[PDB]
Each structure stands twice: as structure tokens, then as C-alpha cells.
């Protein structure tokens, strides 16, 4: 679900869609670790 708060997700990471968060803020916050891998479909 939201890898930060609540329900499953609204959208998936809008650079790959390999991770998902309930709202937008979660994705921007928590992707600090993910930003390093985004762009690669693995
Ligand atoms: Zn969330
Ligand atoms: Zn991504």
C-alpha cells in the first residue's frame, strides 16, 4: 500500500511506477532512497 501512510495508492512513482504511495507527498518524501534507482525498469 502507501509505503508511507495509508491505502494502497493513487498513482505509482511517476518516473517508473515501481513504487506506490497513497498521496503525492509520500512519494516525494520517501523516494529519497528510490531516486537513486528511478529511471531503470528493474
Ligand atoms: Zn501516503
Ligand atoms: Zn521511480
From Swiss-Prot:
Organism of this sequence: Homo sapiens
Lineage runs:
Eukaryota, Metazoa, Chordata, Craniata, Vertebrata
> Any other noteworthy remark?
Defective DEAF1 could confer a growth advantage to the mutated cells influencing the development and progression of neoplasia, e.g. in the case of colorectal carcinomas. Subcellular location in colorectal carcinomas (cytoplasmic or nuclear) is a prognostic factor that identifies a subgroup of patients with reduced survival. In addition, changes in the subcellular location correlates with the proliferative status of the cells.
> What does the record say about tissue specificity?
Expressed in various tissues and cells such as in peripheral mononuclear cells and hormone-secreting pituitary cells. Expression in pancreatic lymph nodes of patients with type 1 diabetes is 20 times higher than in healthy controls. Highly expressed in fetal and adult brain.
What's the subunit arrangement here?
Homodimer. Isoform 1 and isoform 4 may form a heterodimer. Interacts with LMO2 and CLIM2. Interacts with LMO4; LMO4 blocks export from nucleus. May interact with the corepressors NCOR1 and NCRO2. Identified in a complex with the XRCC5 and XRCC6 heterodimer. Interacts (via the SAND domain) with the DNA-PK complex subunit XRCC6; the interaction is direct and may be inhibited by DNA-binding.
Question: PTM details?
Answer: May be phosphorylated by DNA-PK complex in a DNA independent manner (in vitro).
Binding locations of Zn(2+) 1: 2, 5, 22, 26
What this protein is called in its record is Deformed epidermal autoregulatory factor 1 homolog
What function does the entry list?
Transcription factor that binds to sequence with multiple copies of 5'-TTC[CG]G-3' present in its own promoter and that of the HNRPA2B1 gene. Down-regulates transcription of these genes. Binds to the retinoic acid response element (RARE) 5'-AGGGTTCACCGAAAGTTCA-3'. Activates the proenkephalin gene independently of promoter binding, probably through protein-protein interaction. When secreted, behaves as an inhibitor of cell proliferation, by arresting cells in the G0 or G1 phase. Required for neural tube closure and skeletal patterning.
> What disease does the record describe for this protein?
Vulto-van Silfout-de Vries syndrome: An autosomal dominant disorder characterized by intellectual disability, poor speech, motor delay, and autistic features. Most patients have additional non-specific features, including hypotonia and gait abnormalities, seizures, which may be refractory, high pain threshold, and sleep disturbances.
